[PDB]
Amino acid sequence: KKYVCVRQYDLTDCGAACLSSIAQYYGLKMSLAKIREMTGTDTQGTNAYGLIHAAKQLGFSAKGVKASKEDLLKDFRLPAIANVIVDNRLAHFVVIYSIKNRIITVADPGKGIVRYSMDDFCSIWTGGLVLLEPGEAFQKGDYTQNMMVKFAGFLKPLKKTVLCIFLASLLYTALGIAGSFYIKFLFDDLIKFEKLNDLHIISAGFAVIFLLQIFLNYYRSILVTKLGMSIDKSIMMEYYSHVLKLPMNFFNSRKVGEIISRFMDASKIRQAISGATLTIMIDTIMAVIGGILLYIQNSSLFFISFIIILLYGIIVTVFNKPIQNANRQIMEDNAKLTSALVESVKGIETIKSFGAEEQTEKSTRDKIETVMKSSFKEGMLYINLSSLTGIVAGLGGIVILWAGAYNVIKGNMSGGQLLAFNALLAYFLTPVKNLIDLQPLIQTAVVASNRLGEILELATEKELREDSDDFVISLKGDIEFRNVDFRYGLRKPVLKNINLTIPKGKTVAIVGESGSGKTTLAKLLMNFYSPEKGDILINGHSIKNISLELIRKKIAFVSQDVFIFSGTVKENLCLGNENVDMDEIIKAAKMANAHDFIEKLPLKYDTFLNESGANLSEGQKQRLAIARALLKKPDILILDEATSNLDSITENHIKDAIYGLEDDVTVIIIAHRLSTIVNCDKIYLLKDGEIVESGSHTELIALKGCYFKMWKQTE
Amino acid sequence: KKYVCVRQYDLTDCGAACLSSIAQYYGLKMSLAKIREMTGTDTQGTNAYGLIHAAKQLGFSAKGVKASKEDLLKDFRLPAIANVIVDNRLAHFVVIYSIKNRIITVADPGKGIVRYSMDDFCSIWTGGLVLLEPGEAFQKGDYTQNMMVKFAGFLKPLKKTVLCIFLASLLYTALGIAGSFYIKFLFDDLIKFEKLNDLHIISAGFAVIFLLQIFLNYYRSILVTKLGMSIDKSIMMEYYSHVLKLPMNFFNSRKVGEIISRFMDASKIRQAISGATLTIMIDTIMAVIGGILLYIQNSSLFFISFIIILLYGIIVTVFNKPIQNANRQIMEDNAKLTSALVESVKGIETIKSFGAEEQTEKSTRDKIETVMKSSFKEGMLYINLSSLTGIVAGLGGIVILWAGAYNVIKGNMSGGQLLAFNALLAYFLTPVKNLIDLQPLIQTAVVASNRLGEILELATEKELREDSDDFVISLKGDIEFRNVDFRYGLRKPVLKNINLTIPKGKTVAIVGESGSGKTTLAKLLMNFYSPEKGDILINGHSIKNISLELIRKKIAFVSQDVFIFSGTVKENLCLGNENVDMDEIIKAAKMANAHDFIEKLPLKYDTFLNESGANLSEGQKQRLAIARALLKKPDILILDEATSNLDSITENHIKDAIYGLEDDVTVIIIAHRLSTIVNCDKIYLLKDGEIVESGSHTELIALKGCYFKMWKQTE
Amino acid sequence: NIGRELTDEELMEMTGG
Amino acid sequence: NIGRELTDEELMEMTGG
Ligand SMILES: Nc1ncnc2c1ncn2[C@@H]1O[C@H](COP(=O)(O)OP(=O)(O)OP(=O)(O)O)[C@@H](O)[C@H]1O
Ligand SMILES: Nc1ncnc2c1ncn2[C@@H]1O[C@H](COP(=O)(O)OP(=O)(O)OP(=O)(O)O)[C@@H](O)[C@H]1O
Ligand SMILES: [Mg+2]
Ligand SMILES: [Mg+2]
């Protein structure tokens, strides 16, 4: 039956598109983001295990088969997912749809459906297959609708303005159509009857008509621009406000570029909606009016003008696609050249050391040759389109004049009628040209709209959790992990089953090495992720029930890689909390040892902060972050080592801060050196996903365990 | 005398542009590239020490004075160069010209000339002054030239295509003139006298005339496109070929982006040097011909057309500048929005931890507001221009008809001549419109041409030296450094004049740590940078007077960081040397021990590297580089061992290989650890640019010097 | 469905994208 | 000639953009 293949919206989603296409091949449509998150795509790529996982949960009875050299037997159920290494650069996934008569058909997500033979295809793909089959517990359902239906919801409140564009738009042409008739009047009332005074009057009349038309054009355009600005701003702002309320896995899956490009995508939809909702409503009416009027003027040459438009439309449609393919090829080759230029400039040290300037010059010349060949090939395509448009545009005018003259000789129409007709043909040709030219806009706009709406429909962070807020006013209690297990993604679970206990208001240290998720536990306690197995108990109550906002406002966390935002210290230090007095700020600065590098600043009141400023030092950034954490005044704080800038002297001030806080608060320090943890009440050592033992320095040393070996390694 | 200000080409070029503006103020116009050289501008910015040193070198008596707050003393000569902290992020350099009635004039290279009052200027600028005076060594001269004259030399050999284009374009306009008279012929004879047999023949004749016109347009367009591609390719290849041969200081000074952008700038001037010259050659003459045709057709109506063109030119030249002023502001504000948005996506961990998403949402909204305000402000001026042009067009169109009707009724011309003139107005209006519209293209293209050509006029790296290669063709000999002091530019010297000797065919190691040199001395030996005081002596001859090509082809170099180029190992190994047999390559792979890595690869040597050897490990890359060094079979070898991935597994292999050279070739090793240098014959330690001691390991240990402490710290 | 079975380790090592 | 004399190192600190 019908073949289906879903394109790429981003560049890392090769694996997800194949599964979506296979689902749609069996009547299952799902938003690409909702399958993307389920299969757990990472930044680097997609592991086949994730595909099998999402398949067996979705309903498909998948199997991971080591595809042999011979895969021609008619035994397994087609279609199936295959993995390839495209031109030996990076891995990629395609799907095999039909196998018969020494022909393979693959629905490449990159391109359309493409056909290969035995040898050329068999050379490229290195085994591997994923069998999919819609067995039991499968249902054909579609969770995705039309995104534009949602987006018109932004247009609806701004209704009154639209009609003001529409109401003016009629009164525009209603004058313009009159303005065309002047050429007829002159050749009827003035040339033959030499009515001088009437000529003077009609001149001023048509002049004031034209100035009225221009004024109305101005009034229309101002409203169009204002409406476009309003729609565009609303779309961007709604999207950006929604993005912030998602769990962290969304942000870890994608990069920063694929979140920013959504803003240009939204800007595209402004033009799409404005152009469509204006043209479809006004230009078709103008075309109808023009057609009726010219049918009144003359029937036959109306059919001439109709065939002119038909040929123009056919010419545009036949050339729409090859231009797009040529443009895509040019855009690929240009980047493939830019890569070589950048590499050569970077490695000119080696190039000059070995004296191989000709070797790079010839290769760059060959690649420039390819770029120029592609550019000229596409330029010839524009040349052909322009010539084929010009033939119609000119021959149509010539035959229009010829038919008009022939009808004049027969005695059916007058010369003034001919000239008015020829002048008014603009009002029936141009609107149709605009209607035809707008088809690519809708074609790209629907894809852009789907791409942006997939993110919007995705579940927000708040909605997932279940809340019980009024029962627990106070965070205070013992921290415990009960049989908690965790994995970042399809990756092997970094954190295993652990059992840990933390009493009230005690100093706790966490020591780990070689990246065993030492900071992972801090984020899990911050409830950025959810443990699928196990739970976190505070005051004998599981974290999942406590309100998320109170937690996030009453947990203190300092990033191992501190981040500061551009602006002024006064507001940047109190990020998150408004209505803050200077007294507690300065006391926090005193206790966090922050005031002593404020005098050297230009103005204490307004110290303008720059991103990646040369003045700023990482020690000062971490001190600022610690100041914010103490300003949050919680009972639960998490901190990481300075690792630089005289850690020994900062140790004294940190110990003054924690000891001088004078409350029964809980603090968790994560570090890789044992020097400061000697006085810690309780220390936890983490190795390869397991807490080896719980205790303090004295008995860990007496235990004759591995901690003894690390301590001797230190000294 | 008028005030002239030089505009900045690059972002980090504020220091040199001001000096160039001063030079032109004193009538010494010289290329900005040669200023940027002697000023020693780096990627970060410009040191005032460089400005003063350069000014003294030219002849300007320069005095650096801290500008006092009170600056109303007319005791020093003007103008003067001073810094301004326009924003906390970026310092800047500007020129103050004169003070009149407590109003200062400042030529900002970024934005033309701006005037300030005492209240707002003193606030922005920080105390700085550089008094520049012609000290009887200055001379009024001119070194700069007309660059487009040079670039036309590429167009001159393409005489055939240009002449064919000119002839075809002339025939195009001639056919247009012939075909325009259809209305006059129709309304004079054909309609009045009713000659159907004549009507059909005339219609067919004008149809074939128009078809020939379109074919000529197609033929002209193909040649124009081909000529444009040819000139573009020639310019880009010549530019790249010249750039590849410069001393490294140019590449250390600038970024890679500032070298790449010139490629786009080349296609920026292809369109000027083709279209502008074609329009000047063709449309001016064609407009002249149309002028005589209309003049003999009618005089007063020609005067009407002239006033229409005059009004059009006035409006365009009035609105040319403010639209650019709005466009540049929009670009700046859009970039400011994008940077502050990327800063928001990156710091997700903080923004979600502190519960401050409202704070960032409000700021982003107030910034998008500014973006839309700027865009709307530009839109108003654009629509003003659009409506004002239409008013002129329409009023001219109606007035032409009015005047023609007056003329025909009074009995000066006939009916047909009026419509013939309306048809023929295209060939006199469109060329002149193209002439007027072309001005901004030339205005920006001249700056682009200067920016591209200032690089080309610079002297390449080959001819700086003077060599006597025929006398000595052999690298072999003793290396000597005597009183050699080299500096990167105008910063603190990295080396100091030293006495060093390297014997023939002997094993020498150079150890450098704690930020000391270990590569600067190597590149100095490589003749990358010209030593300023002292010389480097080989076999009783200074290296400076030997063919540079042989020296670089007889010294093998392994950098601290390695670079691998996109391709295959087979061609990557023999980079810069063809006519190479596989036998010696396999031998080198024996001594380089790369063979252990080739078996597991799918192809032995035809294996394509994905992207600069991304799949490889750095230790493997270093081994591959070693092989490249060995393939040269150079007299002198320079190695830098891997930091930590040697693992004492390839270290023994490297020792075996260097022992198995089995020839008296000079060997240099640089490392940051003393483990293996025990076998080395002589070892030299460079401390803060000083060779304090020189000798072998045993004597240095016996000396109980700093090397002894380093050895004990190592072991 | 008679092809040779593939272990999960290769599935993890199969990094497509 | 009016103003405070600047040392060479302070001139070296003088940086532009
Ligand atoms: N995007 C990611 N960011 C961080 N860790 C990741 C990511 N994706 C997977 N991981 C894995 O999560 C585990 C824990 O990462 P975490 O950030 O806790 O490191 P860590 O224990 O603090 O290590 P280090 O001290 O070396 O930074 C690691 O095994 C790491 O490979
Ligand atoms: N053109 C240049 N070449 C080398 N160093 C430069 C140059 N311009 C500025 N520098 C600076 O000079 C300093 C010393 O450079 P040097 O060549 O001695 O490096 P190094 O101490 O050997 O370091 P590494 O071992 O990492 O190569 C560095 O701080 C570097 O940034
Ligand atoms: Mg970490
Ligand atoms: Mg070095």
Numbering used by the authors:
A (entry chain B), B (entry chain A): 8 to 722
C (entry chain D), D (entry chain C): 8 to 24
Lines from the paper:
Peptidase-containing ABC transporters (PCATs) in gram-positive bacteria function both as maturation proteases and exporters for biofilm formation, quorum sensing, or antimicrobial polypeptides. Substrates of PCATs are synthesized as precursors with an N-terminal leader peptide. Proteolytic cleavage of the leader peptide at the conserved double-glycine motif is necessary for secretion of the cargo peptide. In this work, we determined the structures of wild-type PCAT1 (wtPCAT1) in the presence of substrate and ATP with or without Mg2+.
To analyze the conformational states of PCAT1 under ATP turnover conditions, cryo-EM samples were prepared using wtPCAT1 mixed with twofold molar excess of the substrate CtA, 10 mM ATP-Mg2+, and the creatine phosphate ATP-regenerating system. Among the 671,000 particles analyzed by three-dimensional (3D) classification, ∼83% exhibit IF conformations with different degrees of NBD separation, 14% are in an NBD-dimerized configuration, and the remaining 3% do not show any protein features. Subsequent refinement resulted in a low-resolution (6.6-Å) NBD-dimerized structure and three molecular structures of NBD-separated IF conformations, referred to as IF wide (IFW, 4.1 Å), intermediate (IFI, 3.7 Å), and narrow (IFN, 3.7 Å), respectively. The three IF structures share a similar overall conformation, in which the two PEP domains dock symmetrically onto the intracellular openings of the TM cavity. The leader peptide (residues 8 to 24) of the substrate forms an L-shaped structure wrapping around the PEP domain. The double-glycine cleavage site (G23/G24) is positioned on a narrow cleft on PEP in close proximity to the catalytic triad residues C21, H99, and D115. Consistently, the density inside the TM cavity is separated from both leader peptides, indicating that the cargo peptide inside the TM cavity has been freed from its leader peptide. Densities consistent with ATP and Mg2+ were observed in all three reconstructions. Different from the NBD-dimerized structure, in the NBD-separated conformations, ATP binds to the Walker A/B motifs of one NBD, distant from the ABC signature motif of the opposite NBD. The majority of PCAT1 adopts an IF conformation in which the NBDs are separated, the substrate is enclosed inside the TM cavity, and the PEP domains remain associated with the transporter core.
